[PDB]
Amino acid sequence: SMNPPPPETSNPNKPKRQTNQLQYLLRVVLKTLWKHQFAWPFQQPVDAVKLNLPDYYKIIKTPMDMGTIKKRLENNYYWNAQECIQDFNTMFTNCYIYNKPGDDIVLMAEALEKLFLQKINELP
Amino acid sequence: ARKSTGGKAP
């Protein structure tokens, strides 16, 4: 019945760097998805209470959203591009896990995923 | 779908 704390977006005990590929993950890949007309279900952690989804955090143990990812990128939380890519993949998988195959949210999620993949193919 | 339901069904 309660929401869990959201994912960490910051940590001073993790070293930091900026790379061309992380810049690209922020200003190309996240930018494209974030501005898409289907982004809104994914722009923030799922609020199980407010949305009355009591099964959500029984089912989803590794939550992730674009709000967290954007924050992570802005906070230099990732060292490697694949860390970030993994978070996107987790966001999309969770959607498929929790929602029914016929649900409009799944079709929103797959539309965003195709775009995501098309962008990752042009990583620098 | 609906803003109120986070785009989730039922």
Author numbering:
A (entry chain A): 42 to 165
B (entry chain D): 7 to 16
Task: Give verbatim lines from the article.
Bromo and extra-terminal (BET) proteins provide a recruitment platform initiated by the recognition of acetylated lysines (Kac) by their tandem bromodomains (BRD, Dhalluin et al., 1999, Jacobson et al., 2000, Owen et al., 2000). BETs, like all of the 42 human BRD-containing proteins, contain additional interaction domains that recruit other proteins to the acetylated protein target, forming complex assemblies and contributing to processes such as chromatin remodeling and transcription. Direct targeting of BET-BRDs by small-molecule inhibitors such as the high-affinity and pan-BET specificity thienodiazepine (+)-JQ1 (hereafter referred to as JQ1) enables their displacement from Kac.
To understand the mode of engagement of a single BET BRD toward adjacent Kac marks separated by longer linkers, we crystallized BRD4/BD1 with a histone H3 peptide carrying K9ac and K14ac (Kac-X4-Kac motif) identified in our SPOT data. While K14ac superimposed well with K5ac from a H4 K5ac/K8ac peptide, the longer backbone linking it to K9ac superimposed with K8ac, sterically filling the remaining volume of the BRD cavity, and resulting in a small helical turn. Importantly, the conformations of S10 and T11, and their contributions to the stabilization of this helical topology, also suggested a functional role for their post-translational modification during binding. Indeed, while both BRD4 BRDs bind in solution to H3 K9ac/K14ac, phosphorylation of S10 had no effect on BD1 binding but abolished binding to BD2, and phosphorylation of T11 abolished binding to both BRD4 BRDs. Phosphorylation on the longer linker on histone H3 (Kac-X4-Kac; the second Kac being outside of the BRD) affects BET binding, potentially linking cellular signaling events to epigenetic circuits.
